[PDB]
Amino acid sequence: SKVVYVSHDGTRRELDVADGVSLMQAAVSNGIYDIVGDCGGSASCATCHVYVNEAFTDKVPAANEREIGMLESVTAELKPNSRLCCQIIMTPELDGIVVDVPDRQW
Numbered sequence: 001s002k003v004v005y006v007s008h009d010g011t012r013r014e015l016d017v018a019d020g021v022s023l024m025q026a027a028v029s030n031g032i033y034d035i036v037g038d039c040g041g042s043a044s045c046a047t048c049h050v051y052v053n054e055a056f057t058d059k060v061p062a063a064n065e066r067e068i069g070m071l072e073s074v075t076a077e078l079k080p081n082s083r084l085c086c087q088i089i090m091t092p093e094l095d096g097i098v099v100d101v102p103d104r105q106w
């Protein structure tokens with residue numbers, strides 16, 4: 001399924017992501033290193049921060065307790081559509097989802 005990661009400078013990086021793969025996994029395995037994923041994907045670091053496009057936020061399961069807590073530590077500006085992408089698992093229903101990657105993660 002289609003996923004587009006927009007870098008801070010506007011560059012679009014499009015990937016075909018399989019079901020069950022997190023957006024953090026797809027990003028780091030494809031060189032989209034503006035997403036770090038330091039903790040390994042267990043919502044414990046906040047370095048996979050992305051801004052989910054407004055037309056897709058309600059299609060993604062809401063943040064769990066752990067993610068809400070970690071989001072309090074994002075380094076880039078927290079926005080209403082901020083999510084830790086290791087928490088977004090790809091499904092056909094999310095086909096075409098666009099996420100904007102902030103300029104910093106650490």
Ligand code: FES
Pocket residue numbers: 024036037038039040041042043044045046047048070084085086087
């Ligand atoms: S990879 Fe650590 S919170 Fe997402």
